[PDB]
Amino acid sequence: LGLTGYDFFWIVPSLVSGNTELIPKEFPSGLISVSYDDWDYSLEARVRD
Amino acid sequence: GWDMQNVITLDTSFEDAKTQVQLKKIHSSVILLYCSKDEAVLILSEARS
Numbered sequence: 001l002g003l004t005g006y007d008f009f010w011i012v013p014s015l016v017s018g019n020t021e022l023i024p025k026e027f028p029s030g031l032i033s034v035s036y037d038d039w040d041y042s043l044e045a046r047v048r049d
Numbered sequence: 050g051w052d053m054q055n056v057i058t059l060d061t062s063f064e065d066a067k068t069q070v071q072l073k074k075i076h077s078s079v080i081l082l083y084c085s086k087d088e089a090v091l092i093l094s095e096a097r098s
Contacts, residue, residue, distance in 0.1 A: 001073040 004028045054078060063091050072096065 004010070010031050017033035057071045072095065084092055 001070075 059092070063095055068095075 010028065012031060012033045014033065014035040017035050020035070020038070054075065057075075059068045059071065062068060080096075082089065082092060
C-alpha cells in the first residue's frame with residue numbers, strides 16, 4: 001500500500017524480533033526493535049549475576 | 050483546482066499482481082472508471098475487496 005519507505009520508520013517490540021538468527025524476507029530494512037541483549041551479555045556473566 | 054491525484058492503467062492480471070499496488074494508493078476521492086461492462090464487473094469487485 002505504500003507505508004514503507006525512507007521517511008517511514010517502523011518500531012516494534014521484542015516479541016516479533018525474537019530468534020534474531022531468522023529474518024523473514026518481508027521485513028523491511030530500518031525496522032527498529034528493542035530486545036534483551038544476547039551479544040555483549042554473555043552466558044557466563046548471566047550465570048554469575 | 051482539479052487536484053488530479055494520478056492516472057492508473059490496468060492492462061491485465063487485475064487480481065493476479067502488478068495491479069493491487071496501483072489501486073491501493075488512491076485515497077478518499079472520486080474515481081473516473083473507463084472500461085467495458087464485463088471488465089467493470091471485475092474492477093468494481095476488486096475495488097470492493
